Every structure is written in C-alpha cells, then in structure tokens.
Design a protein around this ligand. Sequence first.
Ligand code: HEC
Ligand code: HEC
Lengths: 126, 126
Amino acid sequence: QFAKPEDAVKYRQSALTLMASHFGRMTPVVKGQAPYDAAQIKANVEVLKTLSALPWAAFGPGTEGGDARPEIWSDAASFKQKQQAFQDNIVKLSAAADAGDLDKLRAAFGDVGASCKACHDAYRKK
Amino acid sequence: QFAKPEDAVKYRQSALTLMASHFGRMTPVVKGQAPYDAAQIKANVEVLKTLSALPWAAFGPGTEGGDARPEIWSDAASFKQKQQAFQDNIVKLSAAADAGDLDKLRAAFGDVGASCKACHDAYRKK
Ligand code: HEC
Ligand code: HEC
C-alpha cells in the first residue's frame, strides 16, 4: 500500500509510536502507582493487540530506511521469528488482561517489554 | 497518557497517519483498478474501525499544537459531533464490508471520505 519506501517507513514508525503509547501507558498500573480497573486494561490491551500486528507488513523488501538495520532483510527468517515471538507475548498479555489477573498482567508486561528490547538490540539503529 | 501536550500531538498525528493508510489503500479496490476480495477488505476495515476511534482522546484540553485549529477546543460540542459522525460513517463501511457488498462499499467509502474533508475544512490548519 506504499507508493515509495518512504511511505512504508512513515507507516511503521507511526504504528510503533502508537504501540509504544498503548504499552507504556500501563506502566503506572503494573507498578501500583495508578489503580487497576480490569475492564479499562482489557480494552486497552485489545487496542494493543490490533496495533502490534501492524508494523511488520511495512518492512517489505526494499523498504530500507529510518532506523531499521539492514539485517532485517538479510536475516528475514530471524526477523520473522522475533516479531512472531513478540506477538505471542502479546497473546499472553491479552490472556492476563481478559482474566483480570493483576499478577499475570505484571509478569506478561515484563515479558513483552523484554521482547521489545530484544528486537531493538538486533534490528534497530542506535 | 501524555507527559506533555507534544506527546498528544505526536500520538494523534500517528493515529491519523495510520487511518489514512488503511482508508486510502482501498481506493483502487473501490474503483475496480484492483480486485475485490471480500475477506481482505473485511479484515482491513476492522483495523480501520479500531484506528478510527483513537485520535479523539489525544485532543484533550490544553493539547493545542500541530495543525489543529483552536476551534477544536472553543467549539467542543461541534467537534465531538463531527468525530461521532465520522465514526458512524465508519460503522456503515464496516457493515458494507461485513456483508461483502461492493456497491454498498463504494457508497460508504465516499461518505467516509466526505466526513474526513468536512472535519478538515473546519478544524485543520492549511
Ligand atoms: C522487532 C521485531 C521489533 C519489536 C518486537 C519491537 N520493535 Fe520497536 N522498532 C523496531 C524497529 C526496526 C524500529 C525502527 C523502525 C524504523 O524504520 O525507523 C523500531 C522503532 C520503534 C520506535 C520509534 C518509532 C519512530 O517514531 O520512529 C518506538 C517508539 C518503538 N519501536 C517502540 C517499541 C515498543 C514499545 C515495543 C514493544 C511493545 C517495540 N517497539 C517492539 C523493531 C521492533
Ligand atoms: C475531525 C473530526 C477529523 C476527522 C473526521 C478526520 N480528521 Fe484528519 N485531521 C484532523 C485534524 C484536526 C488534524 C490535525 C492534527 C494535528 O494535531 O496536527 C488532522 C490531520 C490528518 C492527517 C495528518 C497527520 C500528520 O501526519 O500530521 C492525516 C493524514 C489525516 N488527518 C487524514 C484523515 C483521513 C484520511 C480521515 C478520514 C478517514 C480523517 N483524517 C478524518 C481532523 C480530522
């Protein structure tokens, strides 16, 4: 859906920006600094779930740019694995949120955060 | 969820960017320049539906910035109506897409596009 590689870069950066917001805005809740409303968190994680599927289709072949490292494309199998795993960690978070289980929420949130960092260490320019 | 008004501006612009992509990428399909796969379009409109609810919460009080006109905040009732209407036009599009009805899809797509322009004429800086 992108006329030029620039448009794919713009898309993925926007998607990752929204993900970051929908993930990070839960940080105070996980830490107990803000109250836990199970229904609020369930709805937010549903949005996160939808958003977390979007960036990967905008790293199509030839869409080098931004702060993407070229290894995303020279090591495609490995990159796919990392996004697939990340999305599996999101499923765990959805399950926690759907169950209304604050302990499972905290644990799953940490695993998601680690998955974010893991990809960035391999595939995002500093 | 925004530490500073700048962060709300960044959020809404990102959300509107993704909306624009998920809406505009259907243009060739509506025109018959690209094939109509009912299931593909149903899934895309589902993403559009989720995205189309997101920008409005990032125009909270005091989040002046970007290309938002100040009338968004001096005329809050009217702005709410325009986003509510826009989202109702999205419901019509979802219904078309869920029914797999290309004629209803074309018509609803045009109405959505008109709703985009209507808000921009009133509330977005040139
Ligand atoms: C690889 C499988 C990734 C996972 C998982 C996550 N991110 Fe990431 N992120 C990745 C890349 C390759 C890039 C660079 C994209 C580019 O073309 O520039 C990014 C970037 C971000 C950004 C910056 C976006 C921008 O405004 O330019 C943010 C805010 C970001 N990523 C956040 C983020 C979070 C919170 C994640 C887990 C919830 C996460 N990303 C996962 C690659 C990958
Ligand atoms: C008011 C109810 C709006 C509706 C409906 C739509 N948009 Fe809009 N849009 C609106 C504002 C006030 C702004 C400026 C936001 C700011 O703070 O800068 C915008 C902006 C856009 C943008 C640019 C985003 C960016 O990268 O800076 C795009 C691409 C955009 N809008 C597209 C768009 C489409 C396709 C719409 C219907 C599907 C649509 N918008 C509706 C206000 C409103």
